[PDB]
From a paper:
Gene transfer agents (GTAs) are DNA-containing phage-like particles produced by some species of bacteria and archaea. The genes encoding proteins that form Rhodobacter capsulatus GTA particles (RcGTA) are derived from phage DNA, which has been integrated into the bacterial genome. Here, we use cryo-electron microscopy (cryo-EM) to determine the structures of RcGTA before and after DNA ejection, and to visualize the interactions of RcGTA with R. capsulatus cells. Particles of RcGTA have heads with a diameter of 38-nm and 49-nm long tails.
The RcGTA tail contains five discs of tail tube proteins (major tail proteins) (Rcc01691, g9), which are organized as a six-entry helix with a twist of 24.4° and pitch of 38.3 Å. The long loop of the tail tube protein mediates interactions between the tail tube proteins from successive discs and between the tail tube protein and distal tail protein. The structure of tail tube did not reveal any changes after DNA ejection, suggesting that the tail is not involved in signaling to trigger DNA ejection after attachment to a cell.
Residue numbers in the entry:
A (entry chain B), B (entry chain B), C (entry chain B), D (entry chain B), E (entry chain B), F (entry chain B), ...: 3 to 136
Write the structure that this text describes.
């Protein structure tokens, strides 16, 4: 078993190796996807859908949500949306290890309520090759 | 940490620098978006979806909801829908700072109930360049 | 602050100036919309989505629901669906004032239950120019 | 005010004037619709969406649900689905009066549970001209 | 009135007349459908949507869900998905009578939980002519 | 009757016959599908939708969710997403028997919360012929 | 004034008119209920909650408790729970008269103590129309 | 000071002005309620919950209990539950004056014991506008 | 009349017919339940809630409490909670006869005090068909 | 120490500054509440629940009960329920000082018994900003 | 028979085998629970609720209360709440034997009065597998 | 053993280290809580509910009640509710030591009676990290 509060997603401050967790984030998710490229012949020994595997494009989608704690790492998340770039990110699956890919911050949104805290959600998409440091 | 009741979205009364909060607004949200322009080559070192970053169009969507308090700032929100223009707006992320862009008021709607208060929601979309005053 | 039970939507009995509230209506809503006509140049000082404002078509959508009280104003709502015309309607935002536009009654529906009352919903759409009498 | 249990929808037994309520039906609804045919000129005094009114096609949709009581009127609802015809139906809005149009029974469905009763839903669509007897 | 536990859906064991209920099934539904083929003339005495009735294709959709009881009738439901055929099925509306049509088993799915029972859902579609034995 | 905790889905460690359950998985589902290829003639003895049966392509979709227990079988699930291949999988319907087909791991996603455990969902799709060992 | 020991609740022995009191019952109660179907208009001359009256479903709940005296009428109460049916019951309000409705025996429970007598409680619910013979 | 035995609740015998006390009633209570419709702005000078007052629906609940004295006024309480109507009632707060509203009798229940008297409780709910005659 | 100390609830020692009372149990209760499946039509001759009777699921709940006497029958109650099974139980209503159903031991709890004895409560739920041997 | 009979809650007679105690009130209570808005980060130095403080909405609830003494201040409590308004109230904590806020009278109820006095309870809720005069 | 003061619940001092009773504890209770996973088929020979037994999750809940005696075993109960872990506990049912499972201390609370002693309650929940040493 | 009158809960006067007991408080309680985050695998060696321990959020709830003695420490408890902040508090478990955390005062309430003293209750909730000074 493994606790969820050790599944940290990290952002670059200087753009080179200085990885810090964003802010108070309450729910986090890295989501991988494949594209299921259908190769169904005339012969499929009963008509089973045969798949190809290597050919589909693959992606990783980050989804993070939490409370607005105005750390410097949170402002470095805000500004890389503005001069929209694809910096390097790092998700630590808590005892798998490090994901370490570049991601583009597609959607950032700051929400508040009269009776609640200021909360931000944060969604990112894969921008390049992913790795696995362990 | 930071309270949500200091995330104010402001509207122009005279159209030039006179920024006031709209009315009793109970939930507010500024939502940013990118367009994820896919550049996936023949070579992607395993088939990872490569993204471009700078090329996608970017947007900001305001979503505000609250109780109908018939302030002058609320009527100035109503009339700019009618002679539909793109005036300047200002969202204050509570200790980031000022957003300060022009927005078009796409959807305004006044709702009431027999056992409830009169409530308005308010949705706006980006009309131009956004800034960050801090 | 302002109560929701003073947000009355009114219908014409004679088709000329004789405006009455429909029936026992429990929830009412006038909903305005713009069309967000995108004008995004090659140059947008960072790629911000620029909007045009004046060009989009604009609309108003009425949504009313309530209990079936068989007033004469309710039958005048029923018959104008049948010989389908675009009579003049009037929404009173409770201390803004009068909306006063022509609307077509798109959807009317009479619903009942074995353990409930007879209820009608009522949805209308903009048929022409809107005003603001205040 | 008016009770919902007097909003009866009636079916023809002999196909000519012999109208009976279907079965134990617990929720009933007649739903009318118009088609909102858009006529938006170059000139619309501000860009308001102008509508035409008389041109859109109009419809009536019956939605009835209830418990399976195997009356003869319920079997006459079953068989007119099979040799699919458009017999005459009659909805009595409880103190408006009679609707009296022909409807096609589009969807009938008999559902049961291990811990529940046998229930049928019943959806019909307009097949011709509607009337209003009052 | 009529109990829902007498609405049995039956499957063929030998493919010829030997009809048995599947397994422990907790919710069952046979759902019929018509296609509402629109015939709206230039003249429709007010613009009412006129329908044709006999022309639309008609269908029957079975939906069954329940607990996985590994009867022989359940394995005969599994194997007819594999060598995908259209065997004869029988729904008994509890005091209407017998439906008796051929159906193709489109979707079968076996689901389990760590704290629950093993449950299967089962969805079928019409494969031919339907009858009514009563 | 049959317990749900004996519906195990198994993954290959060495790619050849060494089948182990993934991790702590809390909900599991194998979902089969057919394609309902419509063959509706001009003659269908009343207009019943006739189906063909053998012609539609057929598929199996695995859906597994559970807690992140970092077993070696869980890392072997992670890596086969990366060098995306179609290894052999095995679902044991608890007293039917073995499913034993090749599947591609389309979607894997590792999710955590500040107050919850680290959880993974896991969705797979059919990559070839399915069997039934019993 | 009127004594409570003349408020007898009676059960059918043969299912047809042969009504006998159950056993030694020490406390008895017939409880009627309405459903308070809310019809609150936009206008209610001050906002008073207006009710409809005729539309709500109505029920009768029997509650009987007493000592286990193993009469034949007590065993006829036990067996109608097992082959669960809705036989006819009769409550005699002592100088109103007879209630005479069908009731389903929802809850029967036989309780004993080491220092007490064997006691049964008995709760029933309305199964149909109620009457009043007086 | 004021005695409680002069707080009489009265029922209509003929339905028009003929008001009599029910029976031997030992405890009586008229209970009024408001709905506390929350209007809490973004600004509330410290975050105090601001309320609206006029908008909430208001109700009156009668609760009466006593001994079963089989007066004609008690039978007129019984029968108006059966053909469930909303007759006019009258509570006399002993030196305020008269309440005089219509009420629906939601719950009536006749209870007896082997060692006690026959007792009835009686609960009513507001059905319309309330007054105050004094 | 009948004593409560002859209302014995019995447990299986060998799992086959060897029924013994548990321990010193001071209060015992078998509680039966039905599910009151509501079938309320549009017509109910006044709006009486009509019930169905045969369709509701039925259950039996055992509740036993007493002093901890460490008999072998008490340890056989403890262990069947651990390897959680549904063995056969037997309640003897003292001159009705035998209940004889299978029950699952849902809740067992051993409680002690500094000034009291060691006491256990014991709650069971129906696991299958119930009988009545008499 | 301080006596409880000097904790007076006062009502406005003229609506402006004329504050009087209601009637014979036997138990009184002003109850304040906060909303505990949870801000629990990913990091909380051990997982302690961190709170925000300023963001939660705050309220004050009056609860008063006593004997019905028909003073003019008691009738001014009755009538402000009817034309439901939010007048100004004043609680004197006996040597703190004055509370002085506006409150809505949510629940008033007049109760009497055959052997008791006429008693009223009285519950109010916060309608706006609270103060502290001391 | 067996005394309650020999039902000791024991805590680990070193985390490995060194089990001591907590403090002066006046009332203690270990409470076991099952989850009653319902498997009710279409056929249940009369509609009896059939249960599954092996599938439900099972738990053990400790409830201990007593006087605050500041032993070292009491401080070892306090600190394992702070760095919240799941250490091993041991309940000795006095002549059954040893329970010996890991438990998480969910709720600890220290209470005192001006005229009473300092008392602590203590509630724990099952964290893993339970045993039975006897 | 240890007396309850040495379990003092202390409040800050200046907000920095100046800790005093509130007032005459008659009953006091600090209550800790964990969140029992369930991690129940497919395998749990018999189906025991396995828990995670470190992941659940943890809290501390103060409950204090007593007589209104208008000390300066009592007014400092009143005012920190008004400008609602999260000051530092200190509970002294009498020979454990000091708790020393920040708490928000959720509920304060001043109650009085005609024959009793003025009493206040006081409930607080955890606002941050807790400590243990001993």
């Amino acid at each position: 078993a493994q606790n969820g509060k050790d599944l940290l997603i990290k952002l670059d401050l200087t753009g080179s190796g200085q990885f810090e967790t964003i802010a108070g984030l309450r729910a986090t998710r890295i989501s991988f996807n494949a594209e299921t490229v259908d190769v169904t012949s005339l012969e499929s020994q009963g008509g089973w859908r045969e798949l190809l595997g290597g050919a589909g494009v693959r992606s990783a989608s980050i989804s993070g949500a939490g409370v607005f704690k105005d750390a410097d790492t949170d402002e470095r998340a805000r500004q890389i949306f503005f001069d929209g770039e694809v910096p390097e990110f790092q998700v630590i699956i808590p005892d798998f290890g490090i994901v370490q890919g570049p991601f583009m911050i597609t959607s950032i949104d700051y929400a508040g309520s009269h009776n609640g805290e200021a909360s931000y959600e944060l969604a990112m998409a894969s921008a390049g090759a992913l790795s696995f440091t362990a």
